[PDB]
Nucleic acid binder design. Sequence first.
RNA 1: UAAAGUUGCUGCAGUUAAAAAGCUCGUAGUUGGAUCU
RNA 2: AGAUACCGUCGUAGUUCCGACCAUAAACGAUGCCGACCGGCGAUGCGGCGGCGUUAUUCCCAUGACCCGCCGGGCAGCUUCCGGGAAACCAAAGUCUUUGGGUUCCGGGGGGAGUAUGGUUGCAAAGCUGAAACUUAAAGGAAUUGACGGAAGGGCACCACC
Lengths: 218, 213, 22, 99, 82, 129, 82, 132, 71
Amino acid sequence: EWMPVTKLGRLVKDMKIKSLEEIYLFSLPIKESEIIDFFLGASLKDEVLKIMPVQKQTRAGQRTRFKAFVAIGDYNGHVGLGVKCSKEVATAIRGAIILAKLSIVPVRRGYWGNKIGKPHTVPCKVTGRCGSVLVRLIPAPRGTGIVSAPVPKKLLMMAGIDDCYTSARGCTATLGNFAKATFDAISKTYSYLTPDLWKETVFTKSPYQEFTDHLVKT
Amino acid sequence: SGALDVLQMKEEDVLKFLAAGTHLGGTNLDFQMEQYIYKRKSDGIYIINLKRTWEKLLLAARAIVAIENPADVSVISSRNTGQRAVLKFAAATGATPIAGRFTPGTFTNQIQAAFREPRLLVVTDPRADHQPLTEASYVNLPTIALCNTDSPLRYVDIAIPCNNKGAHSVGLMWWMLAREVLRMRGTISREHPWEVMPDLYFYRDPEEIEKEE
Amino acid sequence: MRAKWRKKRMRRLKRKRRKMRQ
Amino acid sequence: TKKRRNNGRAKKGRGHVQPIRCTNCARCVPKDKAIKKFVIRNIVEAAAVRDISEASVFDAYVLPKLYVKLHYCVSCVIHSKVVRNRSREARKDRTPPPR
Amino acid sequence: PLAKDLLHPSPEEEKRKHKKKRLVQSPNSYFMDVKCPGCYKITTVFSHAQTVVLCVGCSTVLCQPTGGKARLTEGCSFRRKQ
Amino acid sequence: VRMNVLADALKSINNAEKRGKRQVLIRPCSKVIVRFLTVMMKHGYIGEFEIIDDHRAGKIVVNLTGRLNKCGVISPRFDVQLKDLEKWQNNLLPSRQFGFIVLTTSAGIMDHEEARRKHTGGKILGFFF
Amino acid sequence: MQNDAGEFVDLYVPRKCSASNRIIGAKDHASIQMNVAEVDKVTGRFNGQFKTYAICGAIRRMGESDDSILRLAKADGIVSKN
Amino acid sequence: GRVRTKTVKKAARVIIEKYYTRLGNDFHTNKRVCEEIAIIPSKKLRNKIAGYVTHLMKRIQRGPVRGISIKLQEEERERRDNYVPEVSALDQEIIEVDPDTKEMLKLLDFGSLSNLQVTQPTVGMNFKTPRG
Amino acid sequence: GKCRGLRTARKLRSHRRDQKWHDKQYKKAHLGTALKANPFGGASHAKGIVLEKVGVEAKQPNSAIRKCVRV
RNA sequence: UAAAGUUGCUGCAGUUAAAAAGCUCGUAGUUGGAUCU
RNA sequence: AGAUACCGUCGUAGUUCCGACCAUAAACGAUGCCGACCGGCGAUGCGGCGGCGUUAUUCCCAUGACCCGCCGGGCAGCUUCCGGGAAACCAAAGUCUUUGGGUUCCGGGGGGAGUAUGGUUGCAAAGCUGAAACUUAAAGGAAUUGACGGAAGGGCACCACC
């Protein structure tokens, strides 16, 4: 069973927070992966992008740790990327799955031209950066697919993006920086102010304010 | 205040502020505190505009009152000068006090024993209480601070311009914040003076009392 | 070898070539 | 990599600084780069103060002071242990030791 | 400060600014009438005059050139215009 | 020295918007700057602005609604034909849903969509989204 | 956020900073949503209503959260004049 | 060396925190109560814990203890701390104030107060420290 | 920085022409010394007469006698 | 040929990875402030 | 061990001045110049402006030395999650995939090599311009952890000393 250790975890467990988007609305940190299991656990799929052996030089030989990169996400507009370093590979993979779940961000999807049906591509050109690696996502027409390298393609397919153009600069052989730059670009989709988002923000009650009585009485 | 006659500053409050030295700022002025001062004296001390002080105190009280759980407001003080004031404010208003050392990770590390998740943070000195201010930027925690003329305003959302150096001034301001919070809630009325005199909040410095006793 | 001394040796070779070449 | 923002000297806003000679080795070191020490001492050491005082033909004569200006090149400073290597963060401290 | 009203700055702030960096530039100088104890007419002198201004009806000196404002002689009453 | 006062104006607006400020001072002002600002304002990107009339050259105080992602100039002002407008607006604009390319045209200074409506080309002045 | 038919297709509608009108990202954990209690005009007591101000972490980082919240409160009549 | 180990110190801390009421100032009673209330498998370890318990009790006798906090005595701490002077230190019939704050109060609609007494300003502005 | 002027086409073209010669591949292709020095003379294959059989020692990390022929 | 944004107009670099002339003047070249219903 | 060196005693050219050549330096901020914009703070140099007070100021104002600010141009420094960058770091090395203010020079893996050759300048030394054949899977930058130092500072040890 799951016993929460935070106010957000308790509110989610008690069926008081309706969706993950109510947590995203208030930019609240998610510190328990069981919340993500509660909301998207029936559709989350994780892929191990890389196992990377890192070494620390010691007095007697080389200490070796394993760094697992795990991309998670339902194919319907949520994606996360987690990196975990551990003594053993299996522990690294488990921890990286947990960290990917904890880092899951909402993905905004738009239209390239005319707006028939559901959104298929990125709402506009976005760019993510990580250590000299620059990843640019460009809206693509319907049926284009993802014109990208395999790692950004995995991340973008896991984010529910159907059509995309990709441009990469830097040392994309650094799979970690490539993955983090793609994740950053995908994250910037909902932080980009477009004219359809100009309407004045109407504030609603926070989860920590709406269900204060439940937290106190518990 | 809101241009409300009931919420305007009264004479006895002004005399308390002047006795406590509340309007006495410092020699240095922060560029984000210029809007809260009146003028610099000939000795190099900035005078703090007490009308703006009252406005910010009432704004902080309005922020604190709009927290349904009283314990959700956390009141911090690292310097011993405001420790008793913070403890008395917590006792009177229902806030949760952190007097003394603030352990890093109290907001960001959920494994710690002292882990807590406040909805509002009130600190005495932003410079001395910088650690709770920095950690409030990891957990979406708005912050109220009693800021002097030289106090930095990073991660400070409501700053109350005041002398936060002298024990009288910080104790008086914690007393005023408690009084305004209670008056805004409904407990205790505005038509009679509070039975608690501000001296219950002052840091004593036991040497002075012992030599006096 | 040191770059300055490499350049000095190169200049000595150039002097020898200059004098020998009639 | 660049170790010091000031390049280990004090030459800002000018092109050339006249050199001086190390008081130890006579190395030519630029004046604003040389480590300068002002030694203020007594011509008579502490142990010898009493003998000279009681051999004096005066009363409250007070001993004269010796005024030495030493200029050290960086190698000689480091060897003579007047400056030391410091951590990457302690290097930035230009505050003289309290003495 | 973010929301600093750039259209209507304070007159103290505009007096603090450099004469050219003001919202609408204005000189820091002025024209002043000097009256002498032994004269019947008033002489207009620039506050930052560079010439040695003699008395309009005598040989008495009015102001001395200076790196900045002209130094008035002692004994003549100067009143600023506008 | 200073060439392309429109470049300075647009860069000042860009930097003020990045800093989050609510007003930006633009000097010197010019006719092209005023028309570009009017184009930007008709689409709701800046809001009302005021021209301080010195007796030498204009100044402008532009109120800044926090909607401008980026306003930039294209130097030199390349001549643009209608058939070549799509390539420019595909290189410069973040999306086909929003963002405008400003062109100076015999019919006035105006965005690329209205240039298409008037069936006319011109010289690219800049862009904003 | 709309399609051709008219239905809203966004997953959610993010908040905007009350001081900069920029979108507050879903991972902006330095951003706050201050709740400021409103007060009855005659009694001076919390009347149950409040004004909500969302400030992004960028503004709080540069120290402008103070002045931004003060301006927002002044515009709402919560903070008086002078 | 006679430095107590974190095992002995931690156990004595827990014993003071949880079983304050029974614990006394005598070492031997401390030893007996520690044997009765906790499973301490070694007589030497029992005695080390009891000695640190005794020293901690003397430390509380001195007053505050930095390393521990018991609520059963914290309530009485707050009981003592409720000290109210008979005449408030903020109620002074004469308050000396400078001319500039006098002007500020006059602009604050509090120029008609009666407790304020203007003070002579300093004749110089020599407040900075000599640089160097 | 680079020149951005409506009438800088000559400068841009000349600069590209000059700076293309600093590319190894371009200079090798367009200089003619490589084609003169190429034994095949630009051909993909060539015929020869086997002068002798030689054995070339592999480079230091490896140890083998690669069987080549002088043709 | 693309990959090569490793020739870069779009669109690269020049502190330490390759790199800003020792420094000024200066012709051609390039680029040039507001302003006229 | 050898020293053709470091060290010592000398000591020529040179080091000094004049005239004429040479035109190169880690000639360095290893950072072109002009312009705009984008934080805070305390200093400091020059000029100006304003102001309690102190002092040299001999019936006085000046002015000079201080003190407190302000403005402009400088040499810099500290601080910052402006932003940037591989980072070191940089308030410029920022306002760069949200890529166009103007313009000059200049680089294109490491060597061969600033070499050969031709031209040109110089009395010479040399300076400027400047390859290719061939060879090679790296060379290099920044930072990290170790190991080491004939580097510094602490601690321990009667298998260290006293």
